[PDB]
């Protein structure tokens, strides 16, 4: 199948309450596999999936060093960004970074990413070319100039096309029991009277992995997008995800409504109706 490896990082300043807290997590697809928190008693990169546990002490030491160094660079960056934006030392600010790689079946890079946000807003992003940058504003252009001078894009390209994809390939093999298993959704329709005149039909998808899914309602074969309440896909806590879609159905219309489900674990899309 196609797969991704992504690392997420957040630093949040807390002036007068010590130094910014740094949290980073790594995922393969929708599976968390490593975490680091500078507020832990003994900050270290820690395993969160069984298939990464086999990595030896050299891996954990190296990864922990990288994380600790990123926490420090982020703290310097948060000080720099106060300058760039002419901000006071008094407020809490946020610095985010996501990077990683997407691959297809053969493991070659399909797309790489390396991007940053400040105070919840895009700041600077490596373009798909892995050679040029998109800066959001004149502050980020100052970073762009520095990163062009230092040939940072070239460094990222080398990692994203090389090591990123090679780690992902290793992890997919070591984690082949889980990372290479799709769990299809368990689906059903429920009916919830609202008044004499109408009732909700709710189409459920439970127990699925990965998170990507499409769930829609039609009436007489017409998509009901504007009239559908579609909740965000949500974690169950057992690796799997859940989602539902609901429509308000006038009395007697129930058999005109069909729920449609698409997921990688389903060889064909499903159609379901309320079964009284």
């Amino acid at each position: 199948g196609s797969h991704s490896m992504r690392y997420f990082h957040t630093s949040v300043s807390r002036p007068g309450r010590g130094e910014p807290r740094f949290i980073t997590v790594g995922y393969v697809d929708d599976t968390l596999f490593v975490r680091f928190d500078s507020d832990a008693a003994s900050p270290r990169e820690e395993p969160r999936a069984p298939w990464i546990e086999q990595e030896g002490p050299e891996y954990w030491d190296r990864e922990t060093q990288i994380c600790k160094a990123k926490a420090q660079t982020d703290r310097e960056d948060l000080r720099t960004l106060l300058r760039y934006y002419n901000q006071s030392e008094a407020g809490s600010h946020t610095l985010q970074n996501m990077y990683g790689c997407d691959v297809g079946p053969d493991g070659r890079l399909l797309r790489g990413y390396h991007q940053h946000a400040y105070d919840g807003k895009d700041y600077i992003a490596l373009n798909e070319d892995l050679s040029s940058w998109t800066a959001a504003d004149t502050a980020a252009q100052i970073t762009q100039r520095k990163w062009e001078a230092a040939r940072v894009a070239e460094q990222l390209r080398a990692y994203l096309e090389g090591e990123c994809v090679e780690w992902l390939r290793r992890y997919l093999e070591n984690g082949k029991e889980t990372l290479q298993r799709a769990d299809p959704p368990k689906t059903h329709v429920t009916h919830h009277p609202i008044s004499d005149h109408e009732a909700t039909l709710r189409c459920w998808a439970l127990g699925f992995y990965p998170a990507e899914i499409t769930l829609t309602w039609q009436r007489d074969g017409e998509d009901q997008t504007q009239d559908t309440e579609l909740v965000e896909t949500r974690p169950a806590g057992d690796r799997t995800f859940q989602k539902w879609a609901a429509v308000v159905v006038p009395s007697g219309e129930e058999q005109r409504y069909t729920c449609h489900v698409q997921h990688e674990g389903l060889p064909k899309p499903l159609t379901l109706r309320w079964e009284p």
Partner: peptide, 9 residues
């Protein structure tokens, strides 16, 4: 495995 270089903004 992570990207290892420290890059300042």
């Amino acid at each position: 495995g992570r990207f290892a270089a420290a890059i300042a903004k």
